[PDB]
Amino acid sequence: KILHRLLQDS
Amino acid sequence: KILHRLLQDS
Amino acid sequence: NSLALSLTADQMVSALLDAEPPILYSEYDPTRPFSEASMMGLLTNLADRELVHMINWAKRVPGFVDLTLHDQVHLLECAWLEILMIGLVWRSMEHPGKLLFAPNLLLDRNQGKCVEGMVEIFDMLLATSSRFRMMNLQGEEFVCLKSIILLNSGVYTFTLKSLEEKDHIHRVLDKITDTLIHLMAKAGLTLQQQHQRLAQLLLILSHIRHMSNKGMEHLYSMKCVPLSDLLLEMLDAHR
Amino acid sequence: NSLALSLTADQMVSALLDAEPPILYSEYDPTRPFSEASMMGLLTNLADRELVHMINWAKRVPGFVDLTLHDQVHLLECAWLEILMIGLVWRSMEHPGKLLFAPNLLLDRNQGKCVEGMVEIFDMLLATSSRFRMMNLQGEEFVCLKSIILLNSGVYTEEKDHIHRVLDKITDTLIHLMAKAGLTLQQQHQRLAQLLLILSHIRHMSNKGMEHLYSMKCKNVVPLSDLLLEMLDAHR
Ligand SMILES: O=S(=O)(Oc1ccc(I)cc1)[C@@H]1C[C@@H]2O[C@H]1C(c1ccc(O)cc1)=C2c1ccc(O)cc1
Numbered sequence: 455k456i457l458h459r460l461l462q463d464s
Numbered sequence: 465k466i467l468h469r470l471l472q473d474s
Numbered sequence: 475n476s477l478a479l480s481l482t483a484d485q486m487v488s489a490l491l492d493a494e495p496p497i498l499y500s501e502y503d504p505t506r507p508f509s510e511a512s513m514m515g516l517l518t519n520l521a522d523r524e525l526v527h528m529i530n531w532a533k534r535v536p537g538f539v540d541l542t543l544h545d546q547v548h549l550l551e552c553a554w555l556e557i558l559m560i561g562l563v564w565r566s567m568e569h570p571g572k573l574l575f576a577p578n579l580l581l582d583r584n585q586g587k588c589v590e591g592m593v594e595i596f597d598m599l600l601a602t603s604s605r606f607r608m609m610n611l612q613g614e615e616f617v618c619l620k621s622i623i624l625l626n627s628g629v630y631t632f633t634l635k636s637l638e639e640k641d642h643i644h645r646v647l648d649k650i651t652d653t654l655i656h657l658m659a660k661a662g663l664t665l666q667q668q669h670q671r672l673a674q675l676l677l678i679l680s681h682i683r684h685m686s687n688k689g690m691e692h693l694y695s696m697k698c699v700p701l702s703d704l705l706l707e708m709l710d711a712h713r
Numbered sequence: 714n715s716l717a718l719s720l721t722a723d724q725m726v727s728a729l730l731d732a733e734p735p736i737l738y739s740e741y742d743p744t745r746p747f748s749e750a751s752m753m754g755l756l757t758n759l760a761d762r763e764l765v766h767m768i769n770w771a772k773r774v775p776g777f778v779d780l781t782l783h784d785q786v787h788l789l790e791c792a793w794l795e796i797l798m799i800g801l802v803w804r805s806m807e808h809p810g811k812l813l814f815a816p817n818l819l820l821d822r823n824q825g826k827c828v829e830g831m832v833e834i835f836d837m838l839l840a841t842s843s844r845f846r847m848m849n850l851q852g853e854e855f856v857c858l859k860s861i862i863l864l865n866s867g868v869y870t871e872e873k874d875h876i877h878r879v880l881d882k883i884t885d886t887l888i889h890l891m892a893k894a895g896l897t898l899q900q901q902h903q904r905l906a907q908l909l910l911i912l913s914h915i916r917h918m919s920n921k922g923m924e925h926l927y928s929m930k931c932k933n934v935v936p937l938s939d940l941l942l943e944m945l946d947a948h949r
C-alpha cells in the first residue's frame with residue numbers, strides 16, 4: 455500500500 | 465405506487 | 475398548528491413507545507437447511523412484512539403526517555433499510571455474536587457467510603449491536619433514534635413550499651433532541667455525560683447510514699432471489 | 714496513554730486549526746470544464762494532491778498517531794472522501810449555489826450535468842453547503858467535525874476505547890466552543906445534534922459518490938493515480 459509508506463514519512 | 469397508497473390508506 | 479411541536483418530552487416518549495410495531499416471525503424451520511437463496515428469501519419475506527408495519531408506524535411518529543404525501547414517500551424510501559437495521563440491531567443487544575432477525579431466526583456470523591458478500595454487513599450489524607450493549611441503550615432512546623432516522627435521512631435529498639417543509643422537520647428534530655437529553659437527565663448522568671452520550675448515539679446513525687448504503691448496493695444487484703413488489707419500489711428509489 | 718486526553722479544550726482547537734491543510738489550486742487551463750473527461754481530470758488531479766496533505770493532516774489529529782499503523786490506514790481509507798466533501802462544503806459556504814473545488818475552479822450544478830450521474834451528488838453537496846451557511850458554521854466547529862469523521866467513520870469496521878475517549882474529548886470541545894460563543898444549554902445540545910446529523914448525510918454522499926468512482930475507474934474515463942486507486946479499492 456502507498457498509504458502505508460506515506461503514513462510513515464518522518 | 466404501493467408506498468403511496470398505504471401511506472394514504474384509511 | 476402541528477401537535478409534534480406541542481407535545482412535551484414525556485408525552486413524546488410515550489407516543490413513540492405506543493407506536494412501536496411488533497416483532498414479526500419468520501417462515502424458518504431448522505428441519506430444512508437453507509441455501510443462499512433460501513435464507514435470502516426469508517429475509518426478503520420478513521422485511522416485506524415489516525415494511526407494512528413500518529409504514530403505519532411512520533404515520534404515528536409526531537410530525538410525519540404534517541408533511542406532503544410526496545415528502546412522506548421520499549423519507550420512507552430513503553430510510554426504510556436504516557429503520558430495519560436499527561430495529562434488528564436493537565433486538566440483538568442481548569444476543570452477542572447473533573443477529574435476531576426474528577424470535578425463531580437467530581443467525582450466526584458464520585451462517586451469514588451462506589450468502590456471498592453478506593458477511594461484511596453482518597459484522598457491521600454485530601459491531602453496532604455490541605455498541606448499543608456497551609452503552610446500555612434504553613428503549614426510550616431507541617424510539618427517539620429510530621424516529622430521527624425517519625426525519626433526517628431524506629431531509630437533504632428532496633420550491634418555497636419545499637423549503638417550508640424542511641423547516642418543520644428541523645423543529646421536530648430539535649424537539650427529539652430535547653427528549654433525548656431529558657431521558658439522560660432522569661437517568662442521573664452529568665451535563666458532560668449527557669453531551670457525550672448524545673454525541674455517541676448520533677455518531678452511530680452515521681454507521682447505520684453506511685450499512686444501509688452498503689446493503690442497498692447488493693440488494694439492487696441480486697435482483698438482476700426475486701424481490702417483493704413493495705420492496706422493489708423501495709429499491710428503485712436508490713437506483 | 715495518549716496525549717489527546719491531557720489536552721484542554723482551547724488546546725484541542727488550536728492543534729486542529731494549525732493542522733489544517735491548505736486550500737490547493739486547480740490546474741490553470743482557462744477552459745471551463747464542460748466535458749466528462751476534463752471534469753474528472755481536474756477533480757482527480759486535485760483530489761490526489763489533497764490526499765497527500767490529508768495524510769499529514771491526520772497525523773496531527775490528537776490521538777491519531779497513538780493508533781496502530783493498520784488502524785490509521787483503516788480510518789483514512791474509510792473517511793477520505795468524507796473528509797474531502799466536508800472540505801469542499803466548507804469552502805463553498807460563502808458561494809451559495811456554487812461549489813468551490815478550488816479558488817480558481819468554481820462549479821455550479823449546470824456543469825455537474827456534463828458527467829452522467831454527477832448532478833445528484835452536486836445537489837446534495839450544495840444543500841449541505843447551504844445548511845452549513847444557515848447554521849452559521851464556525852471554522853473551529855468545522856475542524857472538530859472533520860476530525861470526528863476521521864475517528865468515527867471506521868471505528869466499527871483496546872483501540873475502540875481510545876477512539877471513543879478522543880471522540881468524547883472532541884464532543885467536550887464542540888460544547889466548549891458553543892459555551893464560549895454564548896449559547897444557552899438548550900441551544901448547545903440542539904446545535905450539537907444538528908451538526909452530527911449532517912455527518913450522516915456526508916456519509917451518504919460519500920457512499921453514493923464512491924459507487925461512481927469505482928465504476929468510472931472500471932470504465933477508465935481518466936487515468937487515476939495509484940494512491941487514489943488504492944483508496945478506491947479499499948471500498949470493495
Ligand atoms: O443490507 S443487508 O445485508 O442486505 C443485503 C443482502 C444481501 C447481500 I450479498 C448484501 C446485503 C440486510 C440487513 C439484513 O440482512 C439483509 C436483510 C435484508 C433485507 C431485505 C431483503 O430484501 C433482504 C435482506 C436484513 C434485514 C434486516 C433487518 C430486518 O428487519 C430485516 C431484514
Ligand SMILES: O=S(=O)(Oc1ccc(I)cc1)[C@@H]1C[C@@H]2O[C@H]1C(c1ccc(O)cc1)=C2c1ccc(O)cc1
Nearest residue numbers: 756757760797798801828829830831834922923925
Ligand atoms: O461523488 S463525487 O461527485 O464523484 C463522482 C464522480 C463521478 C460521478 I458520475 C459521480 C460522482 C466527488 C465529490 C466531488 O466531486 C467528486 C470529486 C472527486 C473526487 C475524486 C475524484 O477522483 C473525482 C472526483 C469531488 C471532490 C470533492 C472534494 C475535493 O476536495 C475534491 C474532489
